[PDB]
Design a protein around this ligand. Structure first.
Ligand SMILES: Cc1nc(C)c(CNc2nc(C3CC3)nc(Cl)c2C)s1
Ligand SMILES: [Mg+2]
Ligand SMILES: [Zn+2]
Length: 323
């Protein structure tokens, strides 16, 4: 079962108008949604309207969907409503800067997949659920949380007056659900490493073809990782504050492991906070930098994401050096 928005919630969203001041702002990659909490659902509607038009979905159905997705995000330190909108905004900026490379169905699917990609996250990693044999890990062997996120997205669409994709043809409805499924699964970081290595191979050899569906799915997969990690592409004070939320969530999981006499990895151990700058250096060098480097190579307009990521890496190097 799913939590449903109240009549007042979606009606309030329907009447919303984005301030003109933010129209130029929202178009940039480094845009931080952080200071505009009350406007987040409205920002999502605005982004949908600019990405695929004002009649892209029935306004009423869209507002119900958005407000219900919001209620099915938990009050965890990081994988919450704020993270969903932040990831959706990064996708909006990638799509706007590469508009015709993607179909109307892909832009529709990807913005919805980004808003739903961590739906009902409990603040626990796939490793934790598998190790402690959680019922969700019994249901899904690999990409446990990601398959749950997709299952929750489908369940929200099935709610009365929430199926934003009902007016698509049977072939189109099936196609968008597959775009959404693969997009959400690709946010499992364990799949990223292999995905990025294959894309680098295809690019260097010159075999990468966006007309080839398998190649297309891999590019979409990398766009998903890039959006999921975009906090590393914001201005340094924003990146720093989000890192506090990221570790608050990891440390809470570590605390749960310590309560059961198990020592967590240093990243999930709050008594190991001095190791954070070196942990971030490793993450930028091994995960974030290659992600945005490959993304810029495939989609040159995404270059500002790589530039901003390199700037934050330098900020982390300064923390390690004592500056
Ligand atoms: C609670 C979380 N769970 C996962 C799986 C996350 C993945 N995203 C990140 N992970 C890290 C790790 C090195 C500390 N750093 C950054 Cl900057 C980001 C964006 S965050
Ligand atoms: Mg996730
Ligand atoms: Zn995420």
């Amino acid at each position: 079962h799913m939590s449903i928005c109240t009549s007042e919630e979606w009606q309030g969203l329907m009447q919303f108008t984005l301030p003109v001041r933010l129209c130029k702002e929202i178009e940039l990659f480094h845009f931080d949604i952080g200071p505009f909490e009350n406007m987040w659902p409205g920002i999502f509607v605005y982004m949908v309207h600019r990405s695929c038009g004002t009649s892209c979905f029935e306004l009423e159905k869209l507002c119900r969907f958005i407000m219900s997705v919001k209620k099915n995000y938990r009050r965890v330190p990081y994988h919450n409503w704020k993270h969903a909108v932040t990831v959706a905004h990064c996708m909006y900026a990638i799509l706007q800067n590469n508009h015709t490379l993607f179909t109307d169905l892909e832009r529709k699917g990807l913005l919805i997949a980004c808003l739903c990609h961590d739906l009902d996250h409990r603040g626990f990693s796939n490793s934790y659920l598998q190790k402690f044999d959680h019922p969700l890990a019994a249901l899904y062997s690999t990409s446990t949380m990601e398959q749950h996120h997709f299952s929750q997205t489908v369940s929200i669409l099935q709610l009365e007056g929430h199926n934003i994709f009902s007016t698509l043809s049977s072939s189109e409805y099936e196609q968008v659900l597959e775009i959404i499924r693969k997009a959400i699964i690709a946010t499992d970081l364990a799949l990223y490493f292999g995905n990025r290595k294959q894309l680098e191979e295809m690019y260097q050899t010159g075999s990468l073809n966006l007309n080839n569906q398998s190649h297309r799915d891999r590019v979409i997969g990398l766009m998903m990782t890039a959006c999921d990690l975009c906090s590393v592409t914001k201005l340094w004070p924003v990146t720093k504050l989000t890192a506090n939320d990221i570790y608050a969530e990891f440390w809470a999981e570590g605390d749960e492991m310590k309560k059961l006499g198990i020592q967590p990895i240093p990243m999930m151990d709050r008594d190991k906070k001095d190791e954070v700058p070196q942990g971030q250096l490793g993450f930028y060098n091994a995960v974030a930098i290659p992600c945005y480097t490959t993304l810029t190579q495939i989609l040159p307009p995404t270059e500002p994401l790589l530039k901003a990521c390199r700037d934050n890496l330098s900020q982390w190097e300064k923390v390690i050096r004592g500056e």
